[PDB]
Amino acid sequence: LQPYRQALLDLEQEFLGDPHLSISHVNYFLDQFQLLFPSVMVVVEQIKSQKIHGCQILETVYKHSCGGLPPVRSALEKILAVCHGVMYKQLSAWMLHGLLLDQHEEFFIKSLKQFSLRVEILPSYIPVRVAEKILFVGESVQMF
Amino acid sequence: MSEPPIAHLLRPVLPRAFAFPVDPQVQSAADETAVQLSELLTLPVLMKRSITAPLAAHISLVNKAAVDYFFVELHLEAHYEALRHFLLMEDGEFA
């Protein structure tokens, strides 16, 4: 939402520059946001009603990543990059130092017991097969 | 059996022994800058246990040292050997 802030800030500079600018002038400059904002609304609205939990959010945006507005697609894509950071962050440990670090949320991994995949949560784009390699590496490091 | 309480060679191990940690300690500080630079911590927050690891070095020296004083210096086995000999009556004639 940062660019919307910059734009509003800029309009003032012009109004400071000239003392009589029509509202229509406002409509024209802000009318690219007129379309991106309604779209992002559903991405959140789905999250609240379905009580989407943990990684299942990562998929909810990805299905709206197929959006027919090129701006929206780029706009949402940024968010997934941010969210992946955490997943990449949690996977950065169980795979590496053999310890899960999760309270209530999950990273699709639940000795040789209490450690197993959560099919429901697993994001779709990530294939089941790769997950198994991951599970193998973490269990492997955990044992030795 | 009498090789362990050398004493004069024990000292050389120590400068080498604590210099050896300096080498990890040399890379660690710089790499701590790289780890700090990378995503705040490239590794999990729990990885900070790597910084406190050198303590083990002092621990090893402590245990080994105690053993020699407790054993060769104090000839402990002989105390167990005599206690067995007289209290458990191993020596045939005394019993």
Side-chain angles (χ1 to χ4, degrees):
Chain A
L1 291 158
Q2 189 47 248
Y4 170 66
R5 301 222 180 91
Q6 192 76 10
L8 189 47
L9 295 174
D10 215 67
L11 268 179
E12 160 81 317
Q13 211 75 13
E14 294 198 58
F15 284 65
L16 173 63
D18 161 278
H20 281 299
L21 295 174
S22 190
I23 296 158
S24 53
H25 216 289
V26 181
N27 191 352
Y28 154 57
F29 283 166
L30 265 45
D31 228 31
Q32 77 180 20
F33 293 91
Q34 190 61 240
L35 77 104
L36 165 64
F37 278 45
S39 309
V40 305
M41 182 53 197
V42 303
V43 172
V44 299
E45 186 48 46
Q46 258 209 48
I47 297 154
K48 292 189 292 185
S49 164
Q50 288 172 339
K51 302 285 294 184
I52 314 197
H53 145 84
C55 290
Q56 268 294 340
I57 296 191
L58 290 172
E59 277 190 65
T60 315
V61 70
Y62 189 66
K63 301 322 190 183
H64 309 134
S65 196
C66 312
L69 319 107
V72 164
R73 160 153 187 176
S74 202
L76 297 194
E77 206 166 272
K78 285 294 300 304
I79 286 151
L80 182 72
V82 166
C83 319
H84 273 166
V86 322
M87 170 275 272
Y88 272 74
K89 169 83 44 71
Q90 298 191 300
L91 184 137
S92 91
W94 196 77
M95 278 197 42
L96 281 291
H97 299 60
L99 295 174
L100 60 95
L101 275 171
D102 226 332
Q103 279 73 40
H104 88 246
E105 296 281 72
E106 323 298 351
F107 58 98
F108 67 76
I109 288 144
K110 199 225 70 57
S111 180
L112 298 101
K113 161 71 126 273
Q114 314 126 40
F115 280 13
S116 179
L117 184 127
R118 263 189 216 71
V119 62
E120 73 282 38
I121 220 83
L122 193 73
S124 67
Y125 32 93
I126 304 188
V128 304
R129 185 251 312 279
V130 76
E132 284 116 53
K133 307 267 169 298
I134 295 159
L135 173 59
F136 161 82
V137 70
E139 293 275 24
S140 276
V141 60
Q142 162 60 29
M143 278 189 94
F144 95 97
Chain B
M1 303 306 100
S2 320
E3 269 291 344
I6 192 59
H8 300 273
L9 158 69
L10 244 67
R11 314 306 273 95
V13 183
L14 269 155
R16 302 288 182 268
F18 274 117
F20 289 162
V22 169
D23 307 314
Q25 286 148 20
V26 162
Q27 65 71 34
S28 80
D31 298 15
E32 185 167 343
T33 87
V35 165
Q36 159 276 307
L37 276 156
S38 294
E39 198 257 315
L40 312 179
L41 287 182
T42 167
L43 304 119
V45 69
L46 295 185
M47 184 55 183
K48 203 174 57 54
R49 64 184 65 191
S50 55
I51 289 145
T52 80
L55 160 67
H58 175 83
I59 284 162
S60 73
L61 290 151
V62 163
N63 303 121
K64 62 189 67 128
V67 181
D68 68 57
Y69 156 100
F70 267 108
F71 279 48
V72 299
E73 195 177 326
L74 267 295
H75 38 277
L76 175 58
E77 73 78 28
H79 311 337
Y80 286 121
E81 195 194 350
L83 208 63
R84 174 182 76 98
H85 275 127
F86 297 108
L87 218 167
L88 313 180
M89 300 152 75
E90 202 273 291
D91 166 28
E93 189 156 356
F94 170 77

